[PDB]
């Protein structure tokens, strides 16, 4: 019923893939409005 963006998105993002770095190519259109899962938060993180 509820979502994550604000202070709670700037940390989970650098949690789920941590030390690879990442992008917004973007996240904030989905996880502010629709309820994302922890699959989508993987695929918006930078592939090595």
């Amino acid at each position: 019923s509820e979502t994550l963006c604000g202070g709670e998105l700037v940390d989970t993002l650098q949690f789920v893939c941590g030390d690879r770095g990442f992008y917004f190519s973007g996240i904030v259109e989905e996880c502010c409005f629709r309820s994302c899962d922890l699959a989508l938060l993987e695929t918006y993180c930078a592939t090595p």
Binding site: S1, E2, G6, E8, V10, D11, T12, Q14, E29, D37
Partner: protein, 1638 residues
């Protein structure tokens, strides 16, 4: 003319000194020479009204004040009959008709004035034309006309608010000097600061020294009074040194600044000196006003404006910008990020001008000190808001300072700043995200960034703009359709505002306001505002005074909040028949007119029944109402009360009150102004307005609230004339009642009791919660803590605090000695602490609920009034128990106790049937917690029915009587009179097992109105045993009765698990951590996010502890889940530094944070994997991989890291491979997780037949045949020598039995002692037994280390004793490892050197390296402590450190462990001085292959020699032909042949060396000595006797000489001589005949 000076609303500009008014010189030669062909360099422009006639300006056509001259003649481009105008931030001259165009366009020449203060030379250029020579646009950079006259300045700022061109110079200062070069005098100056050289009086600000004569003169003291001039930056100094003058003229000085676009800070320049007023012009980029890049971006795909206007921090800003922090790791790589939006910075010391985002770091910050230094400076404010996906706004700067991007070409830093939109308006900083390949990201949370409707340019007379933030309001809701009746002291006037009136509407112009004011004349409308107590509208009428204004009155409109659409209220009227104007002057106001906000909406009635609806405002989940609609998709109404929603994409507006969302279109329905009806027999209704659509019948929402007994959710009533009415019934709409008291006591809660709180206020209370910390005391006079820092006599009651950066203690409200019982809650108001952002006074408010004595409070959310909220659940505020123990713990399997299912705050109204007219309030053994909702059930009752008829009792509590072990075990005596009017309601409760983390209520089943009800709860709480074996963090092994205890590490201190470079995870065993919130075992980085709650039910599975936390933070997954964590413990059979909990992986299936760890606490079994073989102890201790596993490889396939092998421990964990904990052997598949193919079973078993050692593993997985779980795998071992300690390899595959083969030199058995320690060789044919050198432990010491060596002898001896089987031990450091096993001794001979090599093999591991291969310096210090081996702390894998102090240098690369074990090599050197010498220290190649030397005779000695030989049993004796002193000589061809057999030389010649066999004395060639008798080999052919003599001269390519001699049988000893010799074979022949040869 004099129309050439323009003044704006507050300031003025004049073009005065720029124009050559009647001074008769050359005019402005407004040309640069780039392209000119007719050399039409005319452009003679006086600004006001002149042309001055001279060379190329004589014969100008005047009365135009503009020349157009050429080779072809003279023209007029423009006249001056206009006035200069204002463009965006500029002054523009629209000039008039000069001469005609070719098409008669009447040529117009525009001139633009951009101001650049400190411009004496100013020549404009024609940059742009119309391309066709009849529209000439000019750009002029002048000193003139952008500002008013001078103003004095502050400390070093010229800070003026009205003119708004507010410079600053403060980065120009320098504590060193500024050095000026004339011939014989330098000039020494630091602006706004003291002179910093010793030759000068340091009271000065500037002084010049005579560099020819070294004489100081004060050119004035330092000064801070900045003096803006009109077009100039004047700075001047104090009196200083006089010369000779009778007026004693002191040397003052004057400094001027000229703007430049790209100079920077520049050098000061000696201008001149005229009469001791010293002149210094300067080019400083800081002296120049920048332009704001316009920040309004339109919408390409739809029509919606945006706004980034008010976010630019314009002024008050010396480091007063938006700033954003980063905490991360410890006292290094901290950054504080400065950034500003849409314009360059309020200048910060040592960043830049024309930069937007300064990186700026901490230095010696500890103790309220030293904010900044500057490191890296980037960005240019270039682009502006590039809009994105309908709510989110990307924003980019470019052109920063240089960097590298993974060895790519050098590019700039690049700020991106994402602006997602939200509703929480004031005081939201950016939140730092990233520093990743020179793209510094940020993330903003909130502005009013997102919702700007274009407004579709509605221009209704009822509609007026508000340019403060950006708004238009509408009074169309005052289309009041039966008219209004105004009060009037003359007579009642009648009024509507716009578009309504029939009752006075039959006149010319269709009047909506012109009524009789008798017992009249039409009035039209035009209107205006100034937003300052002022929202007005005129009423223009027809019967005007001649050449004057008609009857036109004003209505001032201000804002009330808590009132209806309103009532016009008649401020004074006054008739004036003398003057033609006549104004009624009626002025009222309503709520519905002004800026919408969060309305604080506690409100009341005249009838004294106070209300509150703010019990509903705190909803993070936005409310929803249910609907009825047609066969298509059902609509969806969102709805809130008194507080707007979070940015639903596609319903725009400012206050989104109610956003009607279907699939297709998004209708904004409402805004936020509350006025419930309170006078009726009915109740509340609250109204939302301004849909601003629907054919001038605008949308509105009025949700209607009546009181219900239960919680509810709204619904859709009907819809008419495109407004709505809903319905919504919940508890809150019942009239609430509260009472007031004093000195922390209250009274009369409708129960007749008192409320003491001063026991809680006895000592201090610290709520160590989040980023803040609150020291406060209950019932005031807070004195203790680190905050009594104040001087004023007012009392401290509460004051918050920070950590290091600007750590402040601003005091909250003062002690006011009050509390109030408000609807079952106790709360205090603490008003009046010091100031917030704007005006706001910090108030604190402390709540109380009554509970079971849990007196640790916690702070809740921050309100908009800068207030702080607090919450306790104490044991004080609830008087009337009827309590029982409500249990039977006498027998087990009985559902023994029901303690935790009681409730005291509010109570269970059951999960009833759909369509219950009744409300079943019941809790298990407590008598009705008093709900504050409505006329209550009397609290003596425990089972009660509300809904429909009266509160009636259904029974009273009694301690549990059961009927069975299982069921029907609570019963309620003495409910009310039944239809029999005999017995009272006797009601029973049943309970049943399930598993439900949030169970249901007792489900209401039966109803027989004659005194009997039953209730059966499907519970989770029925079946368990309270004597779970410990229920603290200690567990007992079911197998052998061993006790596992863990409470030696149950700290509140916590621990650190690393998941990044810049983020930690906090962790505390069987107890709550102190950093994160209470009820949290583990929590994340920046905001404290729970993973699971701390439980102590430590289970046990398979030599592993599996502690489980559950019920943590809400997970983002498709199904509603939480995080959970399994801290899985492993036996570590030592204590090392690496025993800290490493986060091992995340699982994305159900949100599971996995956790490995280690300890020695957890192994019951003493780990030994070393077994006996008759007399020989064998061991496999050094073959344990200690840091990771080993990998058994991909086999029998291609294009695939397939097995993980660990012999007698479990394997060391490794980030990102979730092989579940305590695994010996792990198969990594190509899909899904890896699999437990065995755990470590027991000691190595033998095979008594073959003597090749097995070891086995049992599993806890089923086979692929489902055959009786017990998955097996066993490893073999194979004795075979070599250096490598070897790998596993998989050979044989059964369906569920894997067999790993292994080659290792360890299982090789120790033979009987040796053959000997003796270099027995086939070639030199005589050995060197070093049994003599088997003595004792040597001590060779060289460099920073010592050594301990021993040959054919181990020495775990005098120093450490633990170098087990160590032949070469490093005694240096602490516990230096072994180099080579004494069984693995491989004695060797080196041929060309003729020296003995002693090699050892397979000791411990060569020390580890970085990933980059730059080796480590392993006696080092981290955090004061010293360590040897690669530590895990604050990074997720092992890492060494490549400096002596990680606190100093910050160099590290990850500890990638080698498989190359250590080894050693010893050399021995022939030295005649001593038989046994000393070993020496040669080399450490990456510090493992350490090699040793010797100075010996023991390996050399040919002294005791037998040169006798037997072949085929045919013996000889040759002791006769030897010559022990002297040798027989024969000298042919000039060569002297001195030789005798199996001897040294004896009384030999000059210059032939020691132990010489043959030394030839040559004539022209060098003396060579060839042949030796220790490698001498004698043999007899059929006829000849042969011998060899090696180690002579270098013949060819590693070739030597050999005297192979012929011994034919003869009768008498002869002499040999030389037959032939070649160069290919380098062989010598000798034809000897002797008697003693055969």
């Amino acid at each position: 003319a004099l129309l050439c000076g323009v003044s704006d609303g507050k300031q003025r500009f004049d073009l005065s000194a720029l124009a050559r008014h009647s001074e008769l010189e050359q005019n402005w030669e407004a040309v640069d020479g780039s392209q000119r062909e007719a050399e039409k360099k005319h452009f003679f422009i006086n600004i006001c009204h002149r042309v001055l006639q001279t060379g190329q300006a004589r014969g100008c056509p005047e009365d135009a004040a503009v020349c157009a001259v050429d080779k072809n003649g003279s023209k007029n481009l423009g006249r001056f009959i206009s006035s200069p105008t204002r463009e965006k931030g500029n002054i523009q001259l629209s000039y008039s008709d000069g001469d005609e165009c070719g098409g008669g366009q009447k040529i117009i020449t525009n001139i633009t004035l951009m101001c650049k203060p400190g411009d004496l030379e100013s020549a404009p250029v024609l940059t742009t034309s119309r391309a066709d020579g009849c529209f000439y646009e000019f750009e002029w950079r002048t000193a003139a006309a952008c500002v008013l006259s001078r103003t004095e300045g502050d400390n070093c700022t010229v800070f003026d608010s009205q003119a708004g061109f507010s410079f600053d110079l403060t980065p120009l200062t320098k504590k060193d000097a500024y050095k000026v070069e004339t011939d014989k005098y330098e000039f020494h100056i630091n602006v706004c600061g003291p002179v910093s050289v010793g030759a000068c009086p340091p009271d000065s600000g500037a002084c010049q020294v005579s560099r020819s004569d070294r004489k100081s003169w004060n050119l004035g003291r330092s000064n801070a009074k900045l003096s803006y001039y009109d077009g100039m930056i004047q700075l001047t100094y104090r009196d200083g040194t006089p010369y000779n003058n009778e007026k004693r003229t002191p040397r003052a000085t004057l400094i001027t600044f000229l703007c430049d676009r790209d100079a920077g800070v520049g050098f000061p320049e000696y201008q001149e000196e005229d009469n001791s007023t010293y002149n210094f012009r300067w080019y400083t980029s800081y002296a120049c006003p920048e332009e704001p890049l316009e920040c309004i971006v339109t919408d390409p795909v739809t029509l919606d404006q945006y706004d980034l206007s008010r976010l630019a921090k314009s002024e008050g800003g010396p480091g007063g910008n938006w700033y954003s922090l980063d905490n991360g790791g410890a006292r290094s790589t901290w950054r504080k990020y400065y950034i500003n939006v849409c314009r360059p910075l309020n200048p910060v010391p040592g960043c830049d001008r024309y930069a937007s985002a300064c990186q700026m770091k901490y230095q010696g910050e500890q103790g309220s000190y030293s904010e900044t230094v500057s490191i890296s400076n980037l960005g240019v404010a270039k682009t502006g808001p590039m809009v994105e996906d309908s709510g989110s706004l990307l924003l980019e700067y470019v052109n920063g300072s240089a960097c590298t991007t993974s060895d790519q070409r050098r590019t700039t830093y690049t700020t991106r700043i994402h602006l997602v939109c939200s509703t929480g308006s004031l005081y939201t900083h950016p939140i730092f995200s990233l520093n990743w390949e020179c793209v510094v990201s940020f993330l903003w949370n909130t502005a009013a960034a997102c919702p700007i409707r274009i407004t579709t340019d509605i221009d209704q007379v009822c509609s007026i703009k508000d340019p403060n933030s950006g708004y238009v309001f509408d009074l169309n809701p005052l289309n009041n359709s039966r008219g209004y009746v105004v009060l009037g002291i003359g007579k009642t006037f009648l009024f509507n505002v716009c578009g309504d009136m029939p009752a006075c509407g039959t006149l010319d112009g269709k009047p909506a306001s012109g009524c009789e004011a008798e017992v009249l004349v039409g009035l039209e409308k035009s209107l205006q505002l100034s937003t300052e107590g002022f929202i007005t509208l005129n009423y223009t009428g027809l019967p005007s005074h001649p050449n004057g204004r008609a009857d036109a009155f004003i209505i001032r409109f201000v804002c009330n909040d808590d009132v209806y659409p309103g009532t016009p209220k008649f401020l004074h009227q006054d008739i004036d028949s003398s003057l033609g104007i006549r104004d009624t002057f009626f002025e009222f106001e309503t709520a519905l007119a002004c800026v919408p906000s969060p309305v604080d909406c506690q409100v009341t009635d005249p009838a004294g029944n106070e209300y509150d609806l703010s019990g509903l405002s705190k909803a993070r989940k936005p409310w929803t109402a249910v609907d009825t609609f047609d066969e298509g998709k059902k609509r969806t109404f969102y709805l809130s009360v008194c507080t707007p929603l979070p940015y639903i994409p596609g319903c725009h507006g400012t206050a989104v009150g109610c956003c009607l969302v279907t699939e297709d279109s998004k209708l904004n329905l409402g805004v936020v102004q509350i006025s419930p009806q309170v006078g009726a027999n009915g109740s509340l209704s609250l109204v939302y307005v301004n849909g601003d659509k629907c054919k001038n019948q605008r949308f509105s929402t009025r949700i209607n609230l009546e009181c219900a007994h239960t919680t509810g959710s709204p619904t859709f009533q009907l819809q008419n004339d495109c407004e709505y009415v809903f319905l919504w019934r919940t508890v809150e709409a019942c009239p609430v009642v509260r009472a007031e008291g004093d000195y922390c006591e209250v009274r009369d809660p409708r129960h007749g009791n008192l409320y003491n709180l001063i026991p809680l206020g006895l000592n201090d209370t610290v709520v160590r919660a989040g980023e803040y910390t609150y020291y406060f005391r209950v019932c005031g006079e807070l004195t203790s803590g680190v905050c009594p820092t104040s001087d004023k006599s007012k009392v401290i009651s509460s004051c918050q605090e920070k950590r290091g950066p600007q750590g402040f203690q601003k005091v909250a409200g003062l002690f006011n000695q009050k509390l109030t019982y408000e609807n079952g809650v106790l709360k205090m108001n603490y008003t009046g602490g010091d100031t917030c952002h704007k005006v706001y006074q910090r108030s604190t408010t402390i709540f109380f609920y009554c509970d079971r004595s849990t007196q640790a409070p916690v702070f809740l959310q921050e309100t908009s009034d800068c207030s702080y909220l607090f919450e306790w659940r104490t044991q004080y505020a609830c008087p009337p128990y009827d309590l029982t123990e409500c249990s039977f713990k006498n027998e087990a399997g009985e559902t023994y106790d029901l303690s935790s299912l009681s409730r005291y705050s509010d109570n269970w109204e059951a999960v009833t049937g759909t369509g219950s007219t009744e409300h079943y309030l019941i809790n298990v053994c407590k008598s009705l917690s008093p709900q504050a909702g409505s006329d209550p059930c009397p609290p003596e009752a425990a089972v009660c029915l509300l809904g429909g008829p009266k509160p009636v009792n259904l029974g009273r509590v009694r301690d549990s009587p059961q009927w069975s072990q299982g069921l029907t075990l609570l019963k309620y005596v003495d409910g009310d009179l039944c239809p029999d009017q005999i017995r009272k309601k006797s009601t029973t409760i049943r309970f049943t097992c399930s598993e439900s983390h949030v169970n249901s209520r007792p489900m209401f089943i039966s109803a027989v109105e004659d005194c009997e009800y039953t209730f059966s709860w499907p519970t989770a709480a029925a079946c368990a045993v309270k004597s779970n074996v410990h229920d603290d963090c200690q567990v007992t092994n079911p197998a052998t009765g061993h006790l596992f205890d863990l409470s030696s590490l149950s700290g509140r201190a916590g621990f650190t698990a690393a998941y990044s470079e810049k983020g930690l995870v906090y962790l505390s065993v069987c107890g709550d951590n102190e950093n994160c919130a209470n009820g949290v075992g583990a929590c994340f980085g920046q905001t404290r996010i729970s993973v699971g709650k701390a439980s102590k039910r430590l289970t046990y599975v398979d030599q592993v502890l599996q502690l489980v936390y559950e019920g943590g933070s809400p997970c983002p997954s498709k199904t509603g889940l939480s995080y959970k964590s399994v801290i899985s413990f492993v036996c570590r059979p030592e204590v090392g530094p690496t025993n800290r909990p490493m986060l091992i992986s995340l699982d994305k299936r159900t949100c599971t944070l996995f956790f490995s760890w280690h300890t020695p606490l957890a192994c019951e079994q003493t780990t030994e994997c070393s077994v006996r073989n008759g007399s020989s102890l064998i061991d496999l201790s050094p073959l344990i991989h200690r840091t990771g596993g080993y990998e058994a490889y991909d086999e029998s396939e291609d294009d695939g890291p397939d097995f993980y092998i660990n012999i007698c421990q479990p394997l060391n964990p490794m980030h990102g491979l979730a092989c579940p904990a305590g695994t010996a052997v792990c198969k990594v598949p190509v899909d899904g997780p890896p699999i437990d193919i065995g755990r470590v079973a027991g000691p190595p078993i033998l095979n008594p037949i073959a003597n090749e050692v097995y070891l086995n593993f049992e599993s806890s997985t089923p086979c692929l045949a489902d055959r009786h779980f017990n998955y097996t795998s066993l490893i073999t071992f194979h004795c075979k020598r070599g250096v490598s300690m070897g790998t596993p390899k998989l050979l044989r595959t059964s369906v569920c039995d894997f067999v790993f083969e292994w080659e290792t030199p360890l299982v090789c058995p120790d033979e009987v002692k040796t053959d000997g320690c003796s270099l027995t060789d086939e070639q030199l044919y005589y050995s060197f037994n070093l049994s003599s050198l088997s003595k004792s432990t040597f001590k060779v010491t060289r460099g920073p280390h010592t050594y301990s060596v021993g040959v054919c002898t181990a020495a775990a001896g005098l120093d450490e004793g633990g170098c087990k089987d160590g032949a070469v031990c490093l005694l240096s450091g602490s516990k230096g490892a072994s180099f080579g096993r004494l069984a693995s001794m491989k004695l060797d001979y080196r041929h060309q050197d003729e020296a003995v090599i002693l090699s050892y093999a397979n000791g411990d591991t060569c020390p580890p390296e970085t990933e980059d291969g730059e080796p480590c310096v392993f006696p080092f210090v981290f955090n004061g402590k010293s360590y040897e081996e690669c530590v895990v702390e604050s990074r997720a894998r092992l890492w060494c450190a490549t400096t002596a102090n990680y606190d100093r240098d910050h160099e590290w690369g990850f500890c990638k462990h080698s498989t190359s074990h250590r080894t050693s090599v010893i050399i021995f050197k022939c030295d005649e001085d001593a038989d046994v010498g000393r070993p020496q220290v040669f080399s450490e190649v990456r510090g493992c292959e350490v090699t040793f030397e010797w100075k010996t005779k023991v390996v050399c000695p040919p002294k005791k020699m037998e040169c006798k030989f037997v072949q085929k049993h045919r013996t000889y004796d040759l002791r006769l032909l030897s010559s022990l002193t002297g040798s027989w000589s024969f000298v042919h061809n000039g060569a002297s042949y001195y030789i005798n057999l199996c001897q040294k030389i004896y009384k030999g010649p000059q210059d032939c060396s020691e132990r010489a066999s043959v030394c030839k004395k040559s004539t022209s060639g060098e003396v060579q000595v060839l042949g030796l008798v220790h490698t001498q080999k004698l043999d007899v052919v059929d006829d000849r006797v042969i011998v060899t003599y090696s180690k002579g001269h270098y013949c060819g390519d590693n070739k030597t000489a050999s005297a192979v001699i012929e011994l034919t049988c003869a009768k008498t000893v002869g002499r040999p001589s030389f037959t032939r010799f070649d160069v290919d074979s380098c062989t010598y022949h000798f034809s000897w005949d002797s008697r003693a040869a055969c």
